[PDB]
């Protein structure tokens, strides 16, 4: 395999971490290839669940706890910390909240969160590499509680970063937030990519095509598929009671991605940097409720 940049995996990985049996597990947790029967049973469906009130309470709770766990990871970000160390803390923090770390064995993903450094677009696997001054790192958290998943991510600065890193991360965040600000009933899901790409391109960045935002609730990934680029053909129209993510990945160079031999780590084909933010959203009537928002502080961690 020819790496696209400077980053390399740092093996070996620690033995997978067990989750105590008192924590409720999603279907894929014990499937030998980590396949989710319940997702496979709706594969290729465009229909979007309208959440009951009970479903809404369930999502509020899991997304709140997911934010708490992300905040834990955010407090650990500094030079010399490894991504495995971050994942270990996340793993214990999920268990402390009586939640299952959704990534763990999802289609055999080996860890409890995703750590994506520099040219990694998403789904980086926590490993023995220590964070370096000047890196940007995304941590993606997903928790499962009482049958519901809640999903968010942020990109962080490790020490001081260069102006390009600052502008990439800020623009990405603005892309997310401009998309969220358009969410309300009657808006087509395919419109969000128009908005995101417009802002990205205005600042000289590209928008990853291969990965999309998604419905989420009882399933981790389900309808709708929510592309982040312009002139996409996503199916469906927002309605009160819909729950889904928006998670744009924006890049300094070209948009094209490829995957490491591990089967997960997605990297820019050009080796330039990519950044991401993600929220889980509920469509209401005034608009939308950001289920994964911070409750105690105005801004994402990178500003703070
Ligand atoms: N949280 C994410 C995830 C976790 C684990 C495995 C695959 C994707 P994504 O849906 O945001 O890409
Ligand atoms: Co995520
Ligand atoms: Co997601
Ligand atoms: K990245």
UniProtKB/Swiss-Prot annotation:
Coiled coil: none annotated. The keyword DNA repair does not apply. Zn(2+) 4 binds at residues 151, 214, 247, 278. Its cofactor is Zn(2+); Co(2+); Mn(2+); Fe(2+). Zn(2+) 3 binds at residues 140, 151, 278. GO terms for cellular component: cytoplasm; cytosol; cytosolic ribosome. Its EC number is 3.4.11.18. GO terms for molecular function: aminopeptidase activity; initiator methionyl aminopeptidase activity; metalloaminopeptidase activity; metalloexopeptidase activity; zinc ion binding. Keywords: Acetylation, Aminopeptidase, Cytoplasm, Hydrolase, Metal-binding, Protease, Zinc, Zinc-finger. It is found in: Cytoplasm. A protein binds at residues 123, 221. Binds 2 divalent metal cations per subunit. Has a high-affinity and a low affinity metal-binding site. The true nature of the physiological cofactor is under debate. The enzyme is active with zinc, cobalt, manganese or divalent iron ions. Has high activity with zinc; zinc cofactor is transferred into the active site region by the ZNG1 zinc chaperone. One of its GO terms (biological process) is proteolysis. Belongs to the peptidase M24A family. Methionine aminopeptidase type 1 subfamily. Cotranslationally removes the N-terminal methionine from nascent proteins. The N-terminal methionine is often cleaved when the second residue in the primary sequence is small and uncharged (Met-Ala-, Cys, Gly, Pro, Ser, Thr, or Val). Required for normal progression through the cell cycle. Associates with the 60S ribosomal subunit of the 80S translational complex. This is Methionine aminopeptidase 1. The gene is METAP1. The chain holds residues 81 to 384 of 386 of the full protein.
